[PDB]
């Protein structure tokens, strides 16, 4: 009779486990019943602190009320600019909350671009280090000598040659957040608004995001136009070094400069990048064709021969169109034997570029 | 020690109160007697069965002082 008792015991165990599952279900149901009695709370912004117990809070899409804190809250946490949860009836601040927008085009984070990706900028890389690493790594040496850090470092040169690549490389070397300016939330000189744009420039960067800045329209402001230049000078002239608005500009042309910026502190460093060297272009080919599946022998010097007067972005779409014509002719591989003809056809009025075609 | 405080009555009064308002939890019990009796230990243990940190509040309704 032992086997029958064991069978009924096993069925009993199954039924007990089902009962435990029912226990979990009933506790969840009671928890949701308890949740039903809860009532939502309006989301508001604290404009100003009136007294130790009075606050001015404006609803996200409503009017502003003078209210009071609930009780067991840190009034230190309730500062002008914090998101809080007003009770919907007494309007009392029950709790605070962590905080698109214009900054939706402000960030332009560097990414994981490192030194290895950038090829043929050894002297340029050393210049960036000697200019920037001291303000980052050793700001105290400037106090040791007793001078404000240099702010304006101009890495002027042709666009598409890796200026932002160099900046991202050094940023990843120091793992510092590179906040390249995308105008919105950082526009200053833009004459549409005078001081609100100044406020966005300052507060969005440096204060919130630690340091490491850049600028867009790389040659626009470097080159009503006179008044625009005076306002630019007022924007950039000289700011507190506690907060870094380091203006690492990389204007595309030398003639797009004026003596009004050549003063140190305004634009001190003049890092110069010229047309990419043939060996530098070679290294750029190597790194950019790394990712492409290149089976067989590739003699990159032959494709170097006809790569004169190019930039890095040219070389990148050379690799991309290598892949494109590999798809078009069904080759998982890509060899130099057609690298030759591709480089034969990547030089015309609009630099020919995509017409290079034959490349696998 | 001859006393009777209902168990099921407490349970379903709490059921009703929690249905009305679930924020209210059993946290103790009360008796109007000016002095606690020798009996109160059993009632406090019974309440502890419903709330481990049960605190009994004596409310002297008769005297105003
Ligand atoms: N040294 C380099 N190594 C590898 N790729 C490069 C190098 N320089 C430039 N490139 C390529 O060329 C482009 C460079 O654009 P960039 O110089 O950042 O333009 P801008 O400075 O106007 O934003 C990038 O897409 C990058 O892939």
């Amino acid at each position: 009779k032992l086997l029958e008792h064991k069978e009924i015991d096993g069925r009993l165990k199954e039924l007990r486990e089902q009962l435990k599952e029912l226990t979990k279900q009933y506790e969840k149901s009671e928890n949701d019943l308890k949740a039903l009695q809860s009532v939502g709370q309006i989301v508001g912004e604290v404009l100003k602190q009136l007294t130790e117990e009075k606050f001015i809070v404006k609803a996200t899409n409503g009017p502003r009320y003078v209210v009071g804190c609930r009780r067991q809250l840190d009034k230190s946490k309730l500062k002008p600019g914090t998101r809080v949860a007003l009770d919907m009836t007494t309007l009392t601040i029950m709790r605070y909350l962590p905080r698109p927008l214009v900054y939706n085009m402000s960030h332009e984070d560097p990414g994981n671009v490192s030194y290895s990706e950038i090829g043929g900028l050894s002297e340029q890389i050393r210049e960036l280090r000697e200019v920037i690493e001291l303000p980052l790594t050793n700001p105290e040496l400037f106090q040791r000598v007793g001078i404000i850090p240099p702010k304006g470092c101009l890495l002027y040169g042709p666009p598409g040659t890796g200026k932002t690549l160099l900046a991202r490389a050094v940023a990843s070397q120091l793992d510092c957040n590179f906040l390249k300016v995308v105008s919105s939330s950082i526009v200053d000189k833009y004459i549409g608004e005078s001081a609100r744009l100044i406020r966005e420039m300052f507060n969005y960067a440096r204060d919130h995001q630690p340091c490491i800045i850049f600028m867009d329209e790389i040659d626009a402001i470097g080159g009503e136009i006179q008044r625009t230049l005076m306002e630019l000078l007022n924007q950039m002239d000289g700011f507190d070094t506690l907060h870094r608005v380091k203006m690492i500009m990389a204007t595309n042309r030398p003639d797009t400069l004026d003596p009004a910026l050549l003063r140190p502190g305004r634009l001190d460093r003049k890092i110069h990048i010229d047309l990419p060297n043939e060996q530098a272009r070679l290294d750029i080919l190597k790194i950019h064709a790394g990712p492409i599946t290149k089976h067989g022998e590739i003699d990159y010097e032959a494709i170097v021969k006809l790569s004169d007067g190019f930039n890095g972005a040219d070389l990148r779409n050379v690799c991309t169109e290598a892949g494109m014509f590999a798809i078009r002719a069904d080759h998982d591989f890509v060899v130099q034997e057609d690298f030759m003809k591709a480089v034969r056809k990547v030089a015309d009025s609009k630099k020919l570029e995509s017409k290079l075609d034959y490349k696998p | 020690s001859v006393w009777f405080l209902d168990h099921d009555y407490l349970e379903n009064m709490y059921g009703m109160f929690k249905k009305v308002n679930a924020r209210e939890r059993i946290v103790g019990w009360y008796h109007t007697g000016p002095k606690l009796h020798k009996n109160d230990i059993a009632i406090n243990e019974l309440m502890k069965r419903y709330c481990p940190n049960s605190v009994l509040v004596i409310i002297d309704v008769k005297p105003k002082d």
Side-chain angles (χ1 to χ4, degrees), chain A residues 212-284:
Chain A
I212 318 291
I213 314 306
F214 227 66
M215 71 76 88
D216 58 32
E217 259 275 33
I218 208 64
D219 76 323
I221 75 187
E224 276 215 22
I225 184 54
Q226 308 175 4
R227 304 190 268 239
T228 309
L229 281 171
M230 336 188 191
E231 207 188 23
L232 159 66
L233 269 183
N234 190 69
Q235 296 300 337
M236 72 99 99
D237 46 28
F239 50 87
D240 183 18
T241 202
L242 163 145
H243 59 64
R244 294 188 40 210
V245 179
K246 293 271 197 172
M247 187 28 78
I248 312 109
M249 201 222 307
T251 180
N252 81 329
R253 282 302 101 104
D255 39 347
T256 58
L257 277 309
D258 310 73
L261 318 100
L262 285 208
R263 227 166 77 193
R266 328 292 95 71
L267 278 188
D268 338 16
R269 291 310 307 250
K270 204 251 198 183
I271 305 170
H272 175 24
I273 168 181
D274 64 330
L275 256 178
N277 198 337
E278 282 65 30
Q279 28 179 339
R281 293 201 317 280
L282 175 43
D283 196 16
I284 301 169

Side-chain angles (χ1 to χ4, degrees), chain B:
Chain B
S1 293
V2 201
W3 63 278
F4 175 28
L5 164 155
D6 192 290
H7 257 288
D8 315 315
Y9 203 110
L10 177 148
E11 283 134 41
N12 47 18
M13 209 45 48
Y14 191 105
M16 298 224 207
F17 273 47
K18 182 156 57 47
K19 284 168 38 130
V20 155
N21 194 320
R23 185 151 299 288
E24 260 85 351
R25 323 310 301 299
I26 270 162
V27 295
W29 57 290
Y30 68 81
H31 74 263
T32 61
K35 309 310 170 205
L36 327 105
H37 294 41
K38 218 175 294 323
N39 197 157
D40 84 311
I41 55 138
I43 301 72
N44 191 21
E45 294 285 8
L46 201 148
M47 227 50 61
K48 282 165 90 38
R49 175 211 319 297
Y50 296 100
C51 177
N53 36 11
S54 147
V55 44
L56 138 79
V57 170
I58 299 180
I59 294 177
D60 39 21
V61 53
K62 259 190 162 184
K64 307 139 295 318
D65 38 351

Side-chain angles (χ1 to χ4, degrees), chain A residues 106-125:
Chain A
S106 63
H107 254 117
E108 193 31 62
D109 273 11
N112 264 263
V113 197
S114 60
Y115 283 20
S116 41
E117 337 282 4
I118 284 90
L121 286 297
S122 67
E123 187 269 349
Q124 284 77 27
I125 281 185

Side-chain angles (χ1 to χ4, degrees), chain A residues 117-119 121 159-165 284 287-288 312-313 316:
Chain A
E117 337 282 4
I118 284 90
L121 286 297
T161 44
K163 347 282 291 296
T164 88
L165 273 81
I284 301 169
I287 169 64
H288 267 174
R316 168 217 52 190

Side-chain angles (χ1 to χ4, degrees), chain A residues 340-347 352-358:
Chain A
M340 181 35 48
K341 40 198 71 37
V343 87
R344 266 156 32 181
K345 326 133 176 166
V346 52
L352 209 46
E353 311 208 68
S354 301
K355 185 54 183 174
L356 89 170
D357 291 341
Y358 235 110

Side-chain angles (χ1 to χ4, degrees), chain A residues 60-71:
Chain A
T60 40
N61 203 315
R64 46 173 71 98
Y65 325 90
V66 191
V67 313
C69 156
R70 163 171 58 97
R71 165 52 32 71

